[PDB]
């Protein structure tokens, strides 16, 4: 409600036909209007006066104010609008206000009241639809490549494999003179999602076999977008993603309290991830938490409600808490723990096997490098 | 001797058949990886009957 | 047995020892086109090989 009651008034002391849209105003409808469009609603023929911190919206008719009350509001406009569209409904049940009329017809008025505005908000009614109712440097020639990724993942606590999608662009600076001719060649790639672009410049090959793209690159640093996948994609992490991290959540019930282990599995030993950390959410009545964790920090944070463990650098790696509850209700459901971390490898699985140039003579790559970063990474 | 509380780790299981019972004095525990059963045994033999 | 006169499926677990990769690029006006062709075994050798 923002509408505490529409209603027609005879300044004979009383309301004559008036609508509670739900059981609030009964009494009270009879007792503001019988005084108030007395004194014009304490108006000065003015369309909005407020009284007694209710605004008042009337129109004099005869002895009779027809009458929107509310003491919120929502727009200026709509204010109005509801008591004009009511006042081209009014003279068709009762032609014109006066007293014995509208007491005649309270149930169509009534009625009326209810269809045009419901629960307090104004809706909208017209005559017909009331019937219804009542019916050169080449020393230099050097390239870079760089894969940038982020892998989304959302997992069940099974280890389902749910939804995931990578995405990424393989990005190239290249130092070159002359206008050398490229040959990219990538893994092939599959993708339950979708979504792949290329540069300009970027030719396609049709091969027997294996599959080829070649092209001339801007010189300094621009997104390949090759063709093949593209070095510009949303491939999915579902398609032959490798999700850096699994986690395995066993929750335990200790009784009054909860016992849970956090397993954390990554990729080769050797590899490692850094700026990982693992987001292990707690039930509303905490009490306190202790947690152990053979590497890095982890710390229960209230309001957070969550226990958040930090990891500079891991091999791989897990953590173990022990939670006090207090119990209220019953067993709560749990909410999924979220991870974020960087890898040096792009788990789309991006790999450029080769990329041969010509023009000229071998170009040094000096480096091809990967970063890899998580997305919305989420496991029950 | 005491009462000891006992942590058990085992494999994850699945089955196209069903049936699992566990002991009372067992307990579930949540966690984000591997799943754990915790328990005060009983002394002398009884079926673990673990979560 | 299956028999020793029969058609079996190459699709029932044959082996085909030849799988070919074809790469065709547009290089533009022109079209580059790799064709990659993959054996068993190293050790075995095929003969009378066309493409």
């Known amino acids: 409600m ?13 309301a004559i036909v008036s609508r509670q849209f739900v059981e609030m105003t009964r009494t009270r409808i009879e007792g503001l209007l019988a ?16 009284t007694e911190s209710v605004r008042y919206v009337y129109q004099p008719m005869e002895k009779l104010y027809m009458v929107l009350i509310t003491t919120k509001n929502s727009n200026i406009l709509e204010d109005l609008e509801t008591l004009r569209l009511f006042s081209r409904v009014i003279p068709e049940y009762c032609r014109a206000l006066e007293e014995n009329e509208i007491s005649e017809h309270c149930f169509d008025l009534i009625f009326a009241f209810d269809e045009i505005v419901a629960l307090g908000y104004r809706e909208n009614v017209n005559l017909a639809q009331i019937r219804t109712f009542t019916e050169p440097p080449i020393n230099m020639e050097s390239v870079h490549m760089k894969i940038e990724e982020k892998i989304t993942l959302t997992c069940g606590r099974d280890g389902g494999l749910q ?73 999915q992490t579902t398609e032959e993603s490798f999700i ?63 226990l958040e463990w930090c990891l500079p650098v891991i091999d791989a790696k897990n953590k173990s808490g022990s939670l006090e509850f207090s119990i209220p209700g019953q067993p709560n459901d749990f909410f999924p723990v979220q991870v974020s971390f ?9 790999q450029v096997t080769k990329v041969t140039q010509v023009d000229g003579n071998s170009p040094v790559r000096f480096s091809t490098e990967t970063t890899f970063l998580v997305d919305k990474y989420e496991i029950l």
């Not at 995405?167 to 190239?172: D, F, K, N, V």
């Open 244 to 306: 850096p991290l699994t986690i395995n959540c066993w929750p335990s019930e200790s009784g009054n309290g909860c016992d849970v282990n956090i397993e954390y599995e990554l990729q080769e030993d050797n590899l490692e991830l850094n700026d990982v950390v693992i987001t292990i959410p707690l039930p509303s009545g905490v009490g306190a938490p202790v947690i152990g964790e053979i590497d890095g920090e982890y710390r229960h944070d209230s309001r957070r409600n969550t």
């Open 163 to 235: 939804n995931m999608e990578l995405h990424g662009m393989i990005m190239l600076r290249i130092s070159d003179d002359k206008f050398g001719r490229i040959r990219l060649h990538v893994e092939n790639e599959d993708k339950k999602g979708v979504q792949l672009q290329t540069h300009p410049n970027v030719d396609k090959k049709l091969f027997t076999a294996e599959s080829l793209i070649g092209l001339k690159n801007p010189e300094k640093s621009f997104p390949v977008n090759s063709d093949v996948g593209v070095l510009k994609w949303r491939l």
């Open 342 to 350: 960087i890898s040096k490898k792009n788990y789309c699985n991006i």
């Open 2 to 14: 923002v509408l505490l009651a529409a209603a027609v008034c005879t300044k004979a002391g009383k």
């Open 35 to 50: 005084a108030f469009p007395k004194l014009m609603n304490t108006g000065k023929q003015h369309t909005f006066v407020e």
